[PDB]
Amino acid sequence: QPAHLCFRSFVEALKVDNDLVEINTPIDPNLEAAAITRRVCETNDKAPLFNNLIGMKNGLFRILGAPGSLRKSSADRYGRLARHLALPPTASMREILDKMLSASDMPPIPPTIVPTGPCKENSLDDSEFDLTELPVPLIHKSDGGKYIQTYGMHIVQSPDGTWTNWSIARAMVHDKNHLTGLVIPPQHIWQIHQMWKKEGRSDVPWALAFGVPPAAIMASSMPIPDGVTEAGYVGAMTGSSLELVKCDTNDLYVPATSEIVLEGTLSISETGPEGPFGDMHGYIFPGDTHLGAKYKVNRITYRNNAIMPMSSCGRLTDETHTMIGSLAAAEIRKLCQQNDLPITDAFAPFESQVTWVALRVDTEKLRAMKTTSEGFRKRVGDVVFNHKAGYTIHRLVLVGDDIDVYEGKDVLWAFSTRCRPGMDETLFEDVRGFPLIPYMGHGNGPAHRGGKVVSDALMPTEYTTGRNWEAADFNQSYPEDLKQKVLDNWTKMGFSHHHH
Amino acid sequence: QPAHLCFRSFVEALKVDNDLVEINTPIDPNLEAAAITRRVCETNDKAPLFNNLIGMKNGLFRILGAPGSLRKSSADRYGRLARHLALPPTASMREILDKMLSASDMPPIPPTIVPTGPCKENSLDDSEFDLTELPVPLIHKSDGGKYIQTYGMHIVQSPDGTWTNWSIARAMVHDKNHLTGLVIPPQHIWQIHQMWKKEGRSDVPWALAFGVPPAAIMASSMPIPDGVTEAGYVGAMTGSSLELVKCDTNDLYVPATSEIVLEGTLSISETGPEGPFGDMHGYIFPGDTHLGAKYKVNRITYRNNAIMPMSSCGRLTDETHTMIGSLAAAEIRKLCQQNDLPITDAFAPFESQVTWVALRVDTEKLRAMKTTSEGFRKRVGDVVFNHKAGYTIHRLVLVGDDIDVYEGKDVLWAFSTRCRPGMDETLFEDVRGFPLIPYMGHGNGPAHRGGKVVSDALMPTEYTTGRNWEAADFNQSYPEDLKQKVLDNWTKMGFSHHHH
Ligand SMILES: Cc1cc2c3c(c1C)C(C)(C)CC=[N+]3c1c([nH]c(=O)[nH]c1=O)N2C[C@H](O)[C@H](O)[C@H](O)COP(=O)(O)O
Ligand SMILES: Cc1cc2c3c(c1C)C(C)(C)CC=[N+]3c1c([nH]c(=O)[nH]c1=O)N2C[C@H](O)[C@H](O)[C@H](O)COP(=O)(O)O
Ligand SMILES: [K+]
Ligand SMILES: [K+]
Ligand SMILES: [K+]
Ligand SMILES: [K+]
Ligand SMILES: [Mn+2]
Ligand SMILES: [Mn+2]
């Protein structure tokens, strides 16, 4: 099966790429596996495959860390991500995000039901497993539980059957047959949960599939629109209908090649302690436990030699930056264009801890609008910050066409030199805020509201007659021939490879 | 003579360090020398010494580019700067800035007058030179003149004789015997000029010395206090009285080993076209010429085989970032401490185009103040933004003790995650602004006023009971032994030198 359609094949692909380290000696899921993974993520090293995880029994489980993290080289920086999507390993961010957006104007390709698959190779009923006896990692020393769920896909369906959502939300082990996790607005798992709670009749049928098709985990991490079934979007994006097998204890459908599947229910009544967790912005607040949603597990099915993917998230750079930030930015680019805003590109700079998105403006189009910074900032902020795709983003930075938004040095240069603090900004206090950012949920103001800003790094003439400067850089301050002369004589004169 | 006390010796030192490239074939001062230098600065390469500059006649002149720019290696990153100050080439920024501050609580060591020095080896009177016939560089393709003055020191003295100031301000050739340049408030050259203009009797006696003692050019770039003669501060800092020779046509004193000296007057009445110039924030606005101050040159004296230092300034990283930003930050650190503010460190992040300064707070001291963010931001901003040392800085970022302000990744992380836009900030509109920033002089508001902000990246408990988080990073999320185990087994397991 292709790497983008089968996690086991993805792991092979990373090996074949010389992008894997197999660790065949005993590694402890209590912190060690995650510490190695953390180190990998902070240094852009090869992904670790822990084949000998202390506590692994009857096939449950091996761990792959850092599945969507960065490679060291600039030329294949995003190669792990490209390997989720059948793209060349040298694909640019623009190419990855375009691939992720491509299904937005295609007919869905609904999934195909098949009678079995590898995820049925083994099963444990409700007398045979105990989640506290599996080698679930402790990912950070102060976490409030062992976070089994950092890179699987929750599957829930609307009561009416018309929408089946796939998403990543964290969850940890509560006891032998339950998890707790975040189920928070405006996320689709929360929207669906609310529909079941208003119906009031039963708990939400649920599955959590780990080691799913890589193209599916990418869509699981993207804020595609309300009511859109991720399976059909992934099918359109890949050009192929995904093969799904029915759960044994409910009528949900899971990817045939899932490494591990939990089947059960998400309660419409019960909660339990959840967190704290070392999360995407780089922090943990020890002892900061709060009631979260509670999941009951009735069944586990799994592949022979099952592999659990794990995100050891925190400070730069991991899946929470490369996927949450970039995929939100992609959706925001499209949202802006569908609202008639002249945005060509969007990216969440890593330097902002993916709390900003830089929006590249087609300034020819802007000029024809015959507008002003105040008016345009307000329009952009109203579109983005009132929409779910803007949830995680607290600062938007508008930049003109000379800036490559995928290059954080250039975004920081433009922000720092073209946006006058205060005057060139509009604050938004009456929008939903992202409480997980420390300055929100642990800050001085409302945890769930406000704290957002549009920062206009467009210069005045970009609204009127056009850019009126040149950069004081090698590229722009010297004519072409001179530049080429300098480059051609560089090593000659005495001064100091693309792949590496 | 030691490298920190003699520019010719500094050039040797760079060679000896394997930090120089001598270019002995003909190089054009029209753009080529500056393009090579620009490239060097953008890539942290070796400094270029142009020994064969097209238009060099009777000893005037060779060029050294990038004298205060960065080295590639992390271990001696700041070595050029260390070589201005007799510090080891491995000196940290903290050590460099401490050296630059050390004379603040020492008695001045006034200079020593000597009867001659190398700067008298050659002379050209007012019938023998023509500034338009010297190989003065065109540094950026759109500059409004050939900027002879990017790394020399202007020397002017108060009418009463009590204060002699040394400073760097840009100047370009106007005609055979004049320059034009910036002389703007609140700079000391402007303060002194104003005293001569209020007296009304004559033009300001002036000298401009190029290739001065490196320790002197560092102080020339630092906002030491009003009324303090830089020569005596440099003497205290170095422990040695600087040797100075009298000008031939006026009673000012120049460093004995100056490579090139211009003697003349700064007019109290005349102006001429100045600029545009590709400056420190990375921009040039072509055609944006304005009236500047006008200097008359009556005499040139120079060393045999004179060397003109040149800053090819613009986008990162050059002297305008490493010296203007860092030295302002140093003065601001001291200013804050003298105002009883609990600041331990200050640095202008390069990523901010040196428009921000990050202030590290001693949070134990902060807690004893029993204050709030609003009150503390206001106090800090009032101290800094009402003082000349704050002139160039438009954003202050307050951070707690866990942040190394000399590491821009960490400053950006703290700013992005701990400062809630709007709520955690105070805007300052009724302070002097720095017009050279594009969003000021080419922006939407007053060019000379406002646009400043204090951004508080202190978390709430840092004011009360103490830090209440741990980072989700390898350092803080794992115990010591585990960390050390991981490091010790790193290359063993399969994963990937300080000097490189
Ligand atoms: C890649 C990724 C995405 C996480 C995520 C993680 C990763 C690795 C974790 C598990 C390591 C850390 C926390 N995560 C959570 C999360 N969204 C959320 O509501 N709660 C979370 O706990 N997300 C983001 C979420 O997947 C996106 O917001 C999706 O748009 C949600 O899908 P939806 O649009 O269908 O609701
Ligand atoms: C290192 C350095 C410092 C420049 C500088 C440059 C460099 C290389 C240039 C020449 C390449 C570009 C422009 N510069 C100017 C400048 N200050 C100013 O008033 N006008 C300038 O034109 N400065 C900053 C100035 O030297 C500091 O603000 C000093 O504190 C001034 O000394 P003072 O406190 O005695 O007035
Ligand atoms: K999704
Ligand atoms: K602006
Ligand atoms: K000075
Ligand atoms: K704060
Ligand atoms: Mn969804
Ligand atoms: Mn001074």
Alpha-carbon torsion (A416, A419, A423, A424), positive or negative: negative
CA nearest ligand 2 atom 9, residue = B150
Helix H or strand E encompassing A329? helix A326-338
Q: Do A495 and B40 touch (CB under 8 A)?
A: yes
Q: Do B284 and A473 touch (CB under 8 A)?
A: no
CA nearest ligand 1 atom 14, residue = A169
Residue closest to B244 by CA, chosen among B252, A217, B205 = B252
Shared-domain flag, residues A144 and A1:
yes
CB B217 within 8 A of CB B289: no
Q: Which of A330, A359, A381 is the last residue of a domain?
A: A330
The β-bridge partners of A50 are: A23, A63
Whole-Å CA distances, B343 to A116, B93, B340, B397: 65, 16, 9, 12
- Please check whether residue B429 touches A, CB under 8 A: yes
| Range of the structural domain that residue A471 is part of | 460-500
Residues of B in contact with A32 (CB under 8 A): 482, 485-486
**The two structure tokens encoding residue A463:** 């609204």
Q: Which of A303, A330, A357 is the last residue of a domain?
A: A330
CA nearest ligand 2 atom 18, residue = B169
**The two structure tokens encoding residue A377:** 């900032």
Tell me, in angstroms, the distance from the centre of ligand 4 to residue B290's CA. Answer: 22
CB A117 within 8 A of CB A129: no
CA nearest ligand 1 atom 9, residue = A150
Distance from the B454 Cα atom to the nearest Cα atom in chain A, whole angstroms: 10
CB B398 within 8 A of CB B371: no
CA nearest ligand 1 atom 13, residue = A170
Whole-Å CA distances, A10 to A19, A89, A220, A221, B388: 11, 13, 17, 18, 59
B70-107 as b/e, with b when 16 or more CB fall inside 10 Å? Answer: bbeeeebbbbbbbbbbbbebebebbebbebbbebbeee
Start-end of H helices in B298-450? 319, 326-338, 363-369, 373-385, 408-418, 438-441
String of DSSP letters for A225-291: PTT--HHHHHHHHHTSPPEEEE-SSSS-EEETT-SEEEEEEEEEEEEEEE-----TTSEE-TT--EE
Q: What single-letter DSSP state applies at residue B395?
A: E
The β-bridge partners of B403 are: none
Alpha-carbon torsion (B467, B468, B472, B477), positive or negative: positive
Residues 110-149 of A with CB under 8 A from B: 140-142
Residue closest to A94 by CA, chosen among A399, A352, A346, A355 = A346
Shared-domain flag, residues A371 and A309:
no
Shared-domain flag, residues B351 and B391:
yes
In chain A, the residue whose alpha carbon lies closest to the alpha carbon of B449 is: A420
Lining residues, ligand 2, CB within 6 Å: B 150-151, 165, 167-170, 182, 184, 187-189, 221-223, 279-280, 311, 313, 319-320, 323-324
Residue closest to B388 by CA, chosen among B354, B432, B346 = B432
* Phi, psi of B164, deg, nearest 5: -115, 120
Shared-domain flag, residues A378 and A499:
no
Q: Do A478 and B437 touch (CB under 8 A)?
A: no
User: What does the CA dihedral B254, B255, B256, B257 come to, rounded to 10 degrees?
Assistant: -130
Angle at A372 between CA A369 and CA A374, to 5 degrees: 130
The β-bridge partners of B265 are: B205, B296
CB A117 within 8 A of CB A245: yes
Start-end of H helices in B342-372? 363-369
Q: What single-letter DSSP state applies at residue A57?
A: B
Whole-angstrom Cα distance, residue A144 to residue A291? 12
Residues of A in contact with B413 (CB under 8 A): 282, 315-316, 353
Residue closest to B11 by CA, chosen among B52, B50, B64 = B64
Residue closest to A201 by CA, chosen among A265, A155, A293 = A265
Q: Which atom of ligand 2 is nearest to the CA of B147?
A: 10
* SS3 (DSSP) at A360: strand
Shared-domain flag, residues B492 and B393:
no
Closest by Cβ to A471, choosing from B282, B459, B460: B282
Structure resolution, Å? 1.1
Shared-domain flag, residues A365 and A311:
no
Residues 30-49 of A with CB under 8 A from B: 31-32, 34-36, 38-40, 42-43, 45-46, 48
Helix axes B326-338, B373-385, angle to 10 degrees: 120
Q: Do A40 and B495 touch (CB under 8 A)?
A: yes
Q: Is the N-terminal amide bond of A249 cis, ω within 30° of 0?
A: no
**The two structure tokens encoding residue A111:** 């999934």
Closest by Cβ to A282, choosing from B283, B472, B478: B472
Q: Which atom of ligand 2 is nearest to the CA of B151?
A: 8
Whole-angstrom Cα distance, residue A371 to residue A340? 14
Shared-domain flag, residues B348 and B303:
no
Name the domain count of chain A: 3
Shared-domain flag, residues B309 and B399:
no
Q: How many CB atoms lie within 10 A of CB A424?
A: 24
Shared-domain flag, residues A248 and A337:
no
User: What does the CA dihedral A258, A261, A263, A265 come to, rounded to 10 degrees?
Assistant: -90
* SS3 (DSSP) at B148: coil
Q: Which atom of ligand 1 is nearest to the CA of A280?
A: 12
Whole-angstrom Cα distance, residue B154 to residue B167? 5
CB A193 within 8 A of CB A293: yes
Beta strands in A127-220 (DSSP E): 153-157, 164-167, 171-175, 178-181, 204-210
**The two structure tokens encoding residue B3:** 């490298």
In chain B, the residue whose alpha carbon lies closest to the alpha carbon of A478 is: B141
Shared-domain flag, residues A323 and A365:
no
Whole-Å CA distances, B368 to A333, B376, B467: 47, 13, 14
For B43, counting Cβ atoms within 10 Å of its Cβ (0-12 exposed, 13-18 middle, 19+ buried), the class is middle
Mutational test site, ligand 1, from A170, A179, A192, A281, max ligand atoms within 8 Å of CB: A170
- Please check whether residue B282 touches A, CB under 8 A: yes
Q: Which atom of ligand 2 is nearest to the CA of B186?
A: 36
Alpha-carbon torsion (A174, A177, A179, A183), positive or negative: negative
* Experimental determination technique: X-ray
Q: How far is CA A97 from the centre of its chain?
A: 12
Shared-domain flag, residues B397 and B340:
yes
Ligand 1 in reach of A180 Cβ (< 6 A): no
Residues of B in contact with A410 (CB under 8 A): none
Residues of B in contact with A453 (CB under 8 A): 421-422
User: What does the CA dihedral A4, A66, A265, A109 come to, rounded to 10 degrees?
Assistant: -20
Closest ligand to C-alpha of residue B326 is: 2
Shared-domain flag, residues B324 and B450:
no
Q: Which of B267, B296, B330 is the last residue of a domain?
A: B330
A202-226 as b/e, with b when 16 or more CB fall inside 10 Å? Answer: ebbbbbbbbbbbbbbbbbbbbbbee
